[PDB]
Amino acid sequence: GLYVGGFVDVVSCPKLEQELYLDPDQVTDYLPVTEPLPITIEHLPETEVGWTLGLFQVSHGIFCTGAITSPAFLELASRLADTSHVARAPVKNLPKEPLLEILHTWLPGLSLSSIHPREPSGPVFQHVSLCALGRRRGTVAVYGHDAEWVVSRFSSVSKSERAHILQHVSSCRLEDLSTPNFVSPLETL
Amino acid sequence: GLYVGGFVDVVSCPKLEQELYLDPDQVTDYLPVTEPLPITIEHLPETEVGWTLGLFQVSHGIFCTGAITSPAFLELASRLADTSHVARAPVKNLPKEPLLEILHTWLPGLSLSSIHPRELSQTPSGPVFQHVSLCALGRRRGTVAVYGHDAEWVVSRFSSVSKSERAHILQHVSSCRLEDLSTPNFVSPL
Ligand SMILES: O=C(O)c1ccc(NC(=O)c2cccc(CC3CCCCC3)n2)c(Cc2ccccc2)c1
Ligand SMILES: O=C(O)c1ccc(NC(=O)c2cccc(CC3CCCCC3)n2)c(Cc2ccccc2)c1
Numbered sequence: 214g215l216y217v218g219g220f221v222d223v224v225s226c227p228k229l230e231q232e233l234y235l236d237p238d239q240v241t242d243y244l245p246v247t248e249p250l251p252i253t254i255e256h257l258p259e260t261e262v263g264w265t266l267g268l269f270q271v272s273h274g275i276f277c278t279g280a281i282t283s284p285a286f287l288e289l290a291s292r293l294a295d296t297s298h299v300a301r302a303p304v305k306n307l308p309k310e311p312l313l314e315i316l317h318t319w320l321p322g323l324s325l326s327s328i329h330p331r332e333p334s335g336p337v338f339q340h341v342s343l344c345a346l347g348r349r350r351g352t353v354a355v356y357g358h359d360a361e362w363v364v365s366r367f368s369s370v371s372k373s374e375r376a377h378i379l380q381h382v383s384s385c386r387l388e389d390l391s392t393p394n395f396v397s398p399l400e401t402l
Numbered sequence: 403g404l405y406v407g408g409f410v411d412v413v414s415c416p417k418l419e420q421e422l423y424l425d426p427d428q429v430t431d432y433l434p435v436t437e438p439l440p441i442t443i444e445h446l447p448e449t450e451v452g453w454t455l456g457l458f459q460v461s462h463g464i465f466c467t468g469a470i471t472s473p474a475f476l477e478l479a480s481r482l483a484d485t486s487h488v489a490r491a492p493v494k495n496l497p498k499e500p501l502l503e504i505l506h507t508w509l510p511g512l513s514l515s516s517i518h519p520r521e522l523s524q525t526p527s528g529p530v531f532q533h534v535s536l537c538a539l540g541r542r543r544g545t546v547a548v549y550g551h552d553a554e555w556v557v558s559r560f561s562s563v564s565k566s567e568r569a570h571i572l573q574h575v576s577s578c579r580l581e582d583l584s585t586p587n588f589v590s591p592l
């Protein structure tokens with residue numbers, strides 16, 4: 214599996230309107246989230262590729278760490294990263310070993326799905342999506358083979374927030390995570 | 403009104419464990435096919451977006467011309483060509499006719515589904531071919547599909563197709579009225 218990490222934008226789905234982007238301080242009463250959330254592609258359930266490990270209140274927002282564990286997703290992503298002229302076209306410029314950069318390129322964002330502000334049961338949070346159709350602010354998704362390397366790609370996480378996050382991630386045995394229910398996005402039509 | 407044209411790869415059990423790419427000489431004797439076969443995406447039934455209008459043996463391979471007719475698909479692809487940064491990212495900037503370019507880029511492969519060579523050396527019982535798929539992945543032999551509003555323009559993009567073969571192919575293409583064909587089964591996710 215892979216690790217993913219980054220700040221998230223917090224998004225709710227209205228009836229009528231398309232997308233509502235919350236201020237993260239609107240949901241910080243509900244952090245830390247240590248219960249695993251499904252990680253999906255672009256809010257398509259049926260595309261679970263893994264599981265969050267922790268979301269934490271850090272400096273200006275909400276930092277997520279996750280594991281990407283779906284073998285069908287990983288195999289499909291690797292095939293595309295290696296062989297698809299189209300997946301490869303927008304990257305200047307590719308190592309070989311291109312998977313981590315192809316993921317970062319096409320799934321650059323993390324969206325934390327939350328119930329609307331107006332609410333008071335149900336969980337607050339539903340899933341985290343790797344997002345391509347989202348905003349170019351608020352979130353940058355970094356994919357890597359260990360969590361230390363991932364958390365290293367960020368400048369605004371303090372020494373103690375970093376230690377806190379890694380300690381927590383070190384306690385998660387990946388093989389204890391349940392199978393994600395994944396089908397290709399194209400199979401959902 | 404979209405035409406698609408290209409050389410195909412021929413595949414049996416596509417995207418399944420028993421998948422095998424066939425040399426085009428192996429199915430030579432079952433061409434031409436002018437009956438329409440469904441055109442789907444990535445061998446997914448329920449993604450029919452049009453109908454083939456001929457599969458021909460030519461000098462340099464098996465040439466397929468098709469019509470993309472699904473109004474849901476065409477309307478969705480056109481909208482996305484005009485509005486989706488994702489759809490546009492891997493295409494040259496500011497193309498005229500973004501639909502054509504987006505298709506030509508994202509669905510470059512034409513894959514002709516075949517029965518297994520097992521059944522081919524002993525006179526097949528039923529249809530040798532099932533469908534043609536527009537493919538994102540797995541083009542080998544197998545040129546980049548051209549999409550256009552005009553069938554002559556489409557075929558004439560391949561200099562590997564001679565003038566005579568072009569006439570032969572187009573003879574059956576304009577021989578088809580695009581609207582006596584059934585509506586393909588594609589439904590828009592949007
Ligand atoms: O079901 C299939 O056979 C199939 C084949 C190709 C593609 N993608 C493409 O042709 C394609 C081309 C360029 C860029 C991308 C998206 C990313 C590339 C690989 C890392 C994860 C997503 N997909 C997809 C969609 C898809 C698969 C995986 C993640 C998201 C979407 C599905
Ligand atoms: O709403 C959804 O759940 C969804 C999921 C996946 C994809 N595409 C893909 O994963 C994908 C991957 C490789 C190639 C394509 C073909 C698309 C054709 C039209 C412009 C965009 C490229 N789609 C699409 C776009 C789409 C799919 C099929 C026909 C039209 C539009 C929609």
Ligand SMILES: O=C(O)c1ccc(NC(=O)c2cccc(CC3CCCCC3)n2)c(Cc2ccccc2)c1
Binds near residue numbers: 319345485486489
């Ligand atoms: O509602 C819209 O305005 C809109 C804009 C763009 C796209 N996708 C595309 O333009 C598009 C083009 C090619 C391939 C894909 C699928 C991949 C999804 C995730 C990685 C990158 C591409 N989508 C979609 C379809 C969609 C696809 C996937 C998940 C949800 C919705 C809808």
